[PDB]
Design a protein around this nucleic acid. Structure first.
Lengths: 199, 166, 202, 193, 114
RNA sequence: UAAUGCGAUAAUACGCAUGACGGUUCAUUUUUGCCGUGUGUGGUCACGGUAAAACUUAAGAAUCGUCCA
């Protein structure tokens, strides 16, 4: 007295049957990044990129960078603060799994974003990013002074004060100041490092 | 107008409300093959005069025959109609039968006075509602359907009509 | 083109007077109350035109067609309120007499998505190995559901049975899918056509 | 403390075997994979020298004691077949989960089954009727016909002489029967096919 | 065999979620009007307090359950509330809720079920 | 109601994560039929009901599936 069961067969969709008749255009990496930055509230930032196809390593960095800008520029209530916490917790965990796929600019932005945000730092996200960029060749070949300026400012705020890394950055920061590129960040980093040397 | 008192409007014990069968508008279900019952019924159970819904159509075939009036048909009548339809249409015809006699009827023998309880089962009947579809056909032509309609009309007490799917 | 007349707000019991005059009540669904003033529009259509449409297309066939509706004043036929593009949805018909009672229509622009139950048609049924042997083609689903755009609604689905033998079955997977439409539901692998010799064992 | 408190198979399943199954059968979610839920050991009257469908409980104490030695956890009497019969049972049973389940499987496969004469492979799984939760489960059933192969019934040979055989069932949760076979193979239990 | 309902001005409510346990004390004037919450303490508040001084494992821990009971006792004592009636529901049988109730009774608050 | 919900050690510190597509379960009273009471040569009558039974097009919510057009 024991009955048995037969699992119904699966239903594969027929070929040449469109999934939707609505117009849903394809999105590339550039479009997703633009969409993420063009956000005004934590809710829009949270919904700017969801799903494993769009919530990639580059999207996680963009969310953290934009979150820092919004946190500094605006004051939020309890509900929005909870939204901000959720954004931070998810983005860092994604970064901890796809860190090896990040580019030089993304790593530089990640360090700057983590320094500004007040939430607890994840396991070793800053240290891992430093190790990948510690070859001393990526900073030298970093054509965009923005990435170098963000990295220099981030470490100064975090108080790393690495002797080797700073020595390389000093001539680069001075060159950027002479060229008039990223003066505010370069000057801020140089001033902070000079203060540390005095102290 | 509804015949109830104020306490009934608020604290009625009739929580599960079912519409009585005599006036329910739901179409009857397809006949099954269950055996006929041996439990006597009441005369109302074999009669129903409410019309069919205004959305009834053919379900399986392309042609069919409907009743324009209510009636109560016995088992003997259906058997004669079935033979007439089968002979008239063909052996190679598709026929759906949508009716069946299932309500028992009682009768008492001659020479018995009134009283001393209800009688014993004698035959079975089925109620027919106005506009109801009785038979459906397929694998035939329209002229053949008309011939079937004319063959059975003299054998039934109600007016009949033709239905087509479109 | 169909002609419709405006109505006053009346009770359900006043509908039988319109039919006696020779008009059938109609309702057009699918408007925006903010910009049009109503979510639904009530009118009446002459019975003579209504019967011609049903006969020409059919009770279920007309649901896959697009029609034009002109609204005019009943007292003055030359006063035109406007024009609408709609598709029939359902028809209410008496069971005892087969007369129209109420017509449901949907406002169907050329850029809207609608669900339509399209009838299935057969081609070259006479020339088929199964028919020659002595079988017949049995249709199990007269209508099949599709999601179509307003500008492209298939009048019917053409299924060719010129190369079907006995026991051949055509499932939903094999049905044509014209441009601008997709199959609805998930119950694929459902029998639509069947070439057999059984006659129901009657 | 010179006591057996760990589980070798438990470490193997989660730290070694689980990843391999994921690579062989990719799934969208991590938890979507083969899992072993419980193992049930049953001894009925038909597997004993006693010849009767319904027997008194005092006659089944010996078999209940035998399961305790094999499993290390007390066993329970089967429910009476009807309310009229109260003091008579029809066998004993015990259910194991977690670390205790894995330890029993390791000992059975490594030592006892290889020494059983007519063993080729365990039967194919059978699918049961889903319960109210709607989860499909497969069961693999086999029996051990020589219970005197364990090294524990030697201390009192006369006491455990009547012990003859036992039945074993394993419950597995997986997406398909093929996944069940993959898990069984990972457990080092040959399957008869 | 459901008992008749009895109206009480002060009632104690518990809401047990996946992560925390919430306790509220609400005053009522009639069943037809909304109440006024006078105490609102959850294990979230206790976790933030203890973690700074004494490390705890998680909000749903024995240390936090006792801490929540203590904080509830202080608020009721300050407002001169000594007797409350507990509202019984499915969440009332949670292990975390039962620990809080036991602590409250030992502290001195009189909690009645009926 | 993100101090949410769900989980295959199921405990909750850890895992999935609030968008987007697809499939399921839930307004001129939508307006026709139908039912009840009153009156009636058996209907060219009146009012009400259907949150009792048949019948329209939506929009939203709750799961579920998904590297996402």
């Amino acid at each position: 007295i024991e009955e048995y069961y037969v699992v119904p067969p699966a239903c594969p969709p027929p070929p040449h049957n469109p999934k939707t008749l609505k117009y849903v255009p394809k999105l590339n990496r550039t479009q997703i990044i633009a969409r993420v930055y063009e956000a005004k509230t934590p809710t829009e930032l949270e919904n700017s990129a969801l799903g494993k196809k769009f919530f990639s390593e580059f999207a996680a960095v963009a969310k953290l960078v934009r979150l820092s800008q919004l946190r500094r520029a605006n004051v939020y209530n309890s509900r929005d603060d909870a939204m901000c916490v959720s954004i931070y917790n998810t983005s860092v965990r994604v970064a901890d799994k796809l860190l090896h796929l990040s580019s030089d600019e993304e790593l530089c932005g990640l360090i700057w974003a983590l320094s500004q945000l007040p939430y607890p730092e994840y396991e070793n996200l800053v240290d891992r990013s430093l190790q990948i960029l510690l070859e001393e060749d990526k900073p030298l070949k970093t054509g965009s002074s923005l990435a170098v300026s963000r990295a220099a400012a981030g470490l100064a705020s975090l108080g790393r004060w690495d002797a080797s890394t700073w020595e390389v950055l000093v001539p680069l920061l001075r060159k950027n100041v002479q060229e008039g590129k990223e003066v505010e960040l370069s000057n801020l980093a140089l001033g902070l490092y000079d203060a540390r040397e005095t102290v | 107008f509804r015949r109830r008192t104020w306490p009934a409007v608020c604290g009625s014990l009739h929580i599960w409300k079912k519409m009585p069968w005599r006036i329910d508008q739901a179409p009857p279900p397809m006949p099954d093959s269950k055996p006929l019952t041996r439990l006597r019924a009441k005369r109302y159970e074999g009669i129903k005069k409410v019309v069919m819904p205004n959305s009834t159509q053919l379900q399986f075939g392309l042609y069919g025959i409907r009743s324009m009036e209510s009636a109560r048909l016995k088992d003997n009548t259906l058997e004669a109609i079935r033979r007439t339809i089968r002979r008239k249409i063909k052996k190679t015809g598709r026929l759906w039968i949508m009716i069946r006699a299932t309500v028992p009827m009682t009768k008492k023998p001659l020479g018995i006075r009134m009283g001393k309880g209800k009688g014993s089962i004698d035959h079975y009947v089925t109620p027919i509602r106005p506009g109801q579809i009785l038979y459906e056909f397929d694998r035939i032509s329209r002229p053949i359907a008309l011939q079937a309609l004319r063959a059975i009309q003299p054998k039934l007490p109600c007016r009949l009509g033709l239905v087509e799917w479109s | 083109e169909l002609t419709a007349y405006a109505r006053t707000k009346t009770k359900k019991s006043r509908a039988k007077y319109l039919r006696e005059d020779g008009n059938i009540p109609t309702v057009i669904h699918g408007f925006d109350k903010a910009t049009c003033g109503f979510h639904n529009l009530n009118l009446c259509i002459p019975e003579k035109e209504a019967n011609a449409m049903v006969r020409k297309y059919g009770r279920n066939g007309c649901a896959a067609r697009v029609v034009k509706v002109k609204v005019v004043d009943h007292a003055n036929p030359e006063k035109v309120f406007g024009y609408l593009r709609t598709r029939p949805c359902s028809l209410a018909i008496t069971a005892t007499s087969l007369k129209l009672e109420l017509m449901h229509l949907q406002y169907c622009p050329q850029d809207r998505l609608v669900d339509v139950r399209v009838p299935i048609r057969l081609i070259n049924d006479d020339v088929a190995p199964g028919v020659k042997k002595g079988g017949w083609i049995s249709v199990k689903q007269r209508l099949v559901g599709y999601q179509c755009r307003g500008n492209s609604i298939p009048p019917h689905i053409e299924v060719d049975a010129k190369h079907l033998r006995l026991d051949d079955k055509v499932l939903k997977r094999d049905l044509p899918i014209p441009k601008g439409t997709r199959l609805l539901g998930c119950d694929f692998d459902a029998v639509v056509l069947h070439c057999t010799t059984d006659v129901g064992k009657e | 403390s010179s006591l057996h408190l760990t589980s070798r198979y438990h470490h193997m399943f989660y730290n070694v075997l689980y990843r391999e199954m994921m690579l062989k059968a990719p799934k969208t979610k991590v938890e979507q994979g083969p899992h072993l839920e419980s193992i049930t050991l049953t001894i009925k009257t038909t597997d004993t020298r006693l010849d009767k469908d319904i027997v008194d409980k005092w006659e089944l104490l010996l078999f209940s004691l035998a399961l305790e030695h094999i499993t290390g956890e007390p066993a329970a009497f089967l429910p009476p077949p009807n309310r009229h019969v109260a003091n008579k049972s029809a066998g004993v049973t015990v259910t194991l989960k977690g670390e205790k389940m894995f330890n029993f499987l390791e000992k059975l496969v490594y030592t006892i089954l290889p020494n059983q004469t007519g063993f080729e492979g365990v039967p194919q799984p059978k699918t049961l009727v889903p319960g109210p939760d709607g989860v499909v489960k497969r069961v693999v059933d086999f029996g051990v016909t020589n219970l005197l192969l364990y090294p524990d019934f030697e201390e009192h040979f006369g006491v455990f002489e009547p012990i003859r055989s036992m039945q074993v069932r394993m419950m597995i949760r997986s997406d398909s029967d093929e996944s069940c076979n993959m898990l069984v193979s990972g457990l080092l239990v040959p399957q008869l096919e | 065999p459901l008992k008749p309902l009895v109206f009480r001005p002060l009632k104690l409510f518990f809401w047990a979620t996946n992560r925390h346990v919430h306790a509220k004390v609400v005053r009522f004037s009639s069943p037809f009007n909304e109440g006024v919450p006078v105490v609102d303490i959850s294990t979230f508040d206790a976790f933030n307090k203890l973690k700074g001084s004494a490390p705890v494992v998680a909000p749903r821990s024995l240390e936090c359950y006792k801490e929540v009971a203590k904080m509830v006792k202080e608020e009721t004592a300050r407002q001169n509330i000594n007797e409350v009636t507990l509202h019984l529901n499915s969440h009332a049988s949670d292990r975390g809720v039962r620990e809080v109730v036991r602590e409250l009774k030992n502290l001195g608050l009189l909690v009645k079920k009926v």
